[PDB]
Amino acid sequence: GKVFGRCELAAAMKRHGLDNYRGYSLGNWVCAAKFESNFNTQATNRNTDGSTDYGILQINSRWWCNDGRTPGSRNLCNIPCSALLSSDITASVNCAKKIVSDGNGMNAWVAWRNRCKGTDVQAWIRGCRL
Template structure:
């Protein structure tokens, strides 16, 4: 039994971190502190909820074109970030995809805002859940 307990403890210590999980309000406050306008926060939190369940450490399954999506906003590595594999990427956000998996969401927010600025909200396939009237974010502040 002691051997099993030691083995489980060793695995737990060796396992990689799985990222931070925000709540709707904690994400809204963090994004506001990073300069996102308050009138956009309900949309951004809705997208994060449907893309990653507010989790920072998520890498999505491989897409049909061989690309993957990273982080809280599931940002695609073919266009927006450079994967560690060295695979070709346009890397429009000029960052490593690993930077989108950290608990510090500064790079994720910056890149997501760039995507939204260039392609609009429909850049996210989950936009259909976030395009209508959304609950107010005001209670978070």
């Protein structure tokens, strides 16, 4: 398994191009992970619509990844949901980029809305070596 720290995740997200991606500074992305999964790469939350949210960014199996159990599957990231539970974040960042570029920005992440949107998100990467 793996549970990230905030600066460790900030660095990884920056390496893969998330700082300012589609208008969202890096702290938004770290914040989203913090409140979606508490940085736990294997976080999984099974919902009452039959979909499941997977991994550090809690990516949902209706539109974005395939778990073979979800009604209405679009698999827009063309990715097995299993890949989004990996210890390294590449597949989640790849898919997150497509999310943010093809729905409603970071509104896709309800924890981003609830705990990050409009806050001092720079705090999440403050002091991190980037």
